[PDB]
């Protein structure tokens, strides 16, 4: 009962063929029980399905599939949202949570990034090294991550986020565009060639960078409004 789900974690899946069969199974799992409409025995069932569910993102992240990654990850939070007093804490919970946190910064949803941070005040504190790397990265982001881009990468090579850190790294910030370079500062080829150069907008950075009557129309309306009040 609920097989072909726990016998694959040990070997995990070096290949991707297992995705199709696994995807069919979760449909059965979801069919066998609605996510969480409200039965602690079903909760005992739920924890069984949490592993594949939480493993669900691990496959999407493995194969670079954002649409399922977001979808699967959202489900796990709902599992954690559920009271689930019996919920047995696992080291995975902390590891997976940081992956969202690291991704959230990746998707420049900074407001959401802090939102999650305040959701785990007891986790961050000083322990939970698993999620300590993203916060350090975030602090570096609000501070000069540009210099600290490789400092945090070297601060800890891995925290079970070998791929997790990869998304952030390849998503290099480029807000520095509001400056002068390219024979005006010359430093900050392929970068100087992308979309012709830098990201594409503006021009060569070395050469990159009153009227009452218009006010008349706008002011006219304003003045009448004051009069309009004095009607009655």
């Amino acid at each position: 009962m609920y097989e072909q789900l726990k016998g694959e974690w040990n070997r995990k899946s070096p290949n991707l063929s297992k995705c199709g069969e696994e995807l069919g199974r979760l449909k059965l799992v979801l069919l066998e029980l609605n996510f969480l409409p409200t039965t602690k025995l079903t909760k005992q069932q739920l924890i069984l399905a949490r592993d594949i569910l939480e493993i669900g993102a691990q496959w999407s992240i493995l194969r670079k599939d954002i649409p399922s990654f977001e979808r699967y990850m959202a489900q796990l939070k709902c599992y954690y949202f559920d009271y689930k007093e019996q919920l047995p804490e696992s080291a995975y919970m902390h590891q997976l949570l940081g992956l969202n946190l690291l991704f959230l910064l990746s998707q420049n949803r900074v407001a959401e990034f802090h939102t999650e941070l305040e959701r785990l005040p007891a986790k961050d504190i000083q322990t939970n090294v698993y999620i300590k790397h993203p916060v350090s990265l975030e602090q570096y982001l609000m501070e000069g991550s540009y210099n600290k881009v490789f400092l945090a990468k070297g601060n800890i090579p891995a925290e079970s986020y070998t791929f997790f850190i990869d998304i952030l790294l390849d998503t290099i910030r480029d807000e520095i565009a509001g400056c002068i370079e390219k024979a005006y500062e010359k430093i900050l080829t392929d970068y100087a060639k992308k979309r012709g150069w830098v990201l594409g907008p503006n021009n060569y950075y070395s050469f990159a960078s009153t009227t009452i009557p218009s006010t008349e129309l706008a002011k006219q309306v304003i003045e009448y409004a004051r009069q309009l009040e004095m009607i009655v």
């Binding site: 939102t115 959701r119 602090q139 000069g144 520095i176 004051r226």
Partner: protein, 420 residues
Amino acid sequence: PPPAPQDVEMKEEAATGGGSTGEADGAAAEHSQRELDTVTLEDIKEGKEPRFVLRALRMLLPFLEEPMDTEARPRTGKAASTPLLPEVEAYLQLLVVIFMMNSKRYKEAQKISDDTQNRRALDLVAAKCYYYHARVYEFLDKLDVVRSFLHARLRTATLRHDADGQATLLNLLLRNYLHYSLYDQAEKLVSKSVFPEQANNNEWARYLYYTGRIKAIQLEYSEARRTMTNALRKAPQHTAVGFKQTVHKLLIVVELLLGEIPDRLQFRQPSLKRSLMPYFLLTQAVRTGNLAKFNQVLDQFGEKFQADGTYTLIIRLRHNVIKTGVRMISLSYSRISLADIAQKLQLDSPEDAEFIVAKAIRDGVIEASINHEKGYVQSKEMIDIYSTREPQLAFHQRISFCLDIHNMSVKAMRFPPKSY
């Protein structure tokens, strides 16, 4: 002797109830408020009361369900809403609360069946019964049954009459989780209504407090400052002991994060220092920038902020301190030497200072317009602010709004009832 204070204090309630009944068919919101205030300051003042509330008109627990069982509408609602005041003030905290909520549920069942004089007295005393629900809740634990009923009653609130206490209760539910529940406010954004009457005038400020809190969670200081200040403006009552100290803590920490450096000459209230001095220490540290002292004060006062739902904010400010300091330097000069500013802010080296300045170009301190050359940092503040064209809009639209706010006039001439 004990009877005499009771014998004088528990009889004017009869006169107030008589007035309420007489005006019920007159209809409400012009006399009820006074009776509600009397109820409140009787509750603060709080035996034989259960026997004296016996079926005042005909044509503890057993005393609770005796009256209606005996010879028996807004007055009945008020009586059913204020039998729990004795235990409430006494705060027995025992199962007797579990004996009280059924009265509330019965009152909830009673009021729901009523309907609008009820919507003008019973509807509002519904606010205090919800207050008791929440109290009775937090005593044991939070629950969304109140949330479900409130959400259902929102549609009724959308009917002829509307009270806004429901938003306050929803915020109460949000804060129960506190830093954990953040989708709740996401909902509150869209669900927000006008409720401009502000009839209570305390619910408005109350909700503004937590609105400022949630806004500050996402570091939206530009408007968080103004909303928190406006909320603090509407608090005439004493509300001193541990009541406004939280609001002040939030406002001042938010301000410090933004970059402004306050000074205690602002508030320095007698009944705040003992609880707010940790913020004084941290702000004093920030104004200078002694990181060692900052971490010292942080680890010393680990609690409070942790217990005040603000630990994360200070933890993040621990690096915004640099921007806080740079605000002043950018304000003072008009053509800065990058190396000199680097020395002043003990920065690493010239390229680090240039990068920091660029990062600070964003929005806020006057533009830098760094030239990336000998000009280094320019920070050429805009000039011509002289009520001239340059402040054409700046010193015209300000007055335009300040005068269009004269709608207080039309309100005033639309207020006079001039009975008969």
